[PDB]
Structure 1
């Protein structure tokens, strides 16, 4: 039919992103990744919403 090409992507309510703070990159990101997973402890996943 080809009359519905781009149907759901056009019907989705356009919601833009949010002005969020920057993120550490390189060694600083690994540092945050380390002390959060190994140092700061005390099972759920890193993104577990339950």
Structure 2
């Protein structure tokens, strides 16, 4: 029974190209760690609930 290869690549053609927006140089090493440690202060409490990423 018939088979064909006519459709290879389709979705990569049809998805509209969007440009990457600019951003700062991010931290690295201990610098990144001081930044994370201040954000997560709630979580280091044994009560209440932190949430890393929410879209509401």
> TM-score, normalized by length of structure 2?
0.69
Figure out how many residues of one structure are paired with residues of the other and give that number. Answer: 47
Q: Rg: which structure is higher?
A: 2
**1:17-32 matches, cutoff 5 A:** 17-32=20-35
Moved over 6 A (4+): none
Structure with more helix by fraction = 1
SS of equivalent to 1:48: coil
In structure 1, the partner of 2:6 is 3
Deviation at 1:30, TM superposition (A): 0.9
Deviation at 1:19, TM superposition (A): 1.1
Q: What is the RMSD of the two structures over their aligned residues, measured on CA atoms? A: 1.7
